[PDB]
Write a protein that binds this ligand. Structure first.
Ligand SMILES: [Zn+2]
Ligand SMILES: [Zn+2]
Ligand SMILES: [Zn+2]
Lengths: 9, 123
């Protein structure tokens, strides 16, 4: 549904 | 396979609040605590990667220790009437002895512990 991505720095 | 309860402690627990103005960067804190006897690897995820800068976005918390993760909301055009669909998640995993990215790569999903937070915009 609401996909999570690795957070950016 | 079911997932295991989160080992880390989160502060805040459910909600990351960002108060305007949004001309300048808005930083909110997410304190992750490791109250265990082992080092714990963590990774921060979000539904809106290009809207934030997360420092650090991943790493290892030593046993009996706490880390301040800075969640930085980049300047944008705020619409009071739009509801922020933005969400965050802390994934964690026990650090294998005498140890990285090679660890995350081979981690099966139930090996990961998830905690979700929702972002709230005010002012
Ligand atoms: Zn990305
Ligand atoms: Zn930044
Ligand atoms: Zn950045």
């Amino acid at each position: 549904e609401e996909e999570f991505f690795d957070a950016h720095e | 396979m079911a997932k295991v309860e989160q080992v880390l402690s989160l502060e805040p627990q459910h909600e990351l609040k960002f108060r305007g103005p949004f001309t300048d960067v808005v930083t909110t804190n997410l304190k992750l605590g490791n109250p265990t006897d082992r080092n714990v690897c963590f990774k921060v995820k979000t539904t809106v990667p290009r809207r934030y800068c997360v420092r650090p976005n991943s790493g290892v918390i030593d046993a009996g220790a706490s880390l301040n993760v800075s969640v930085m909301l980049q300047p944008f055009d705020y619409d009071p009437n739009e509801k922020s669909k933005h969400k965050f998640m802390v994934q964690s995993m026990f650090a294998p002895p005498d140890t990285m990215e090679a660890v995350w790569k081979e981690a099966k999903p139930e090996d990961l512990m998830d905690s979700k937070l929702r972002c709230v915009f005010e002012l």
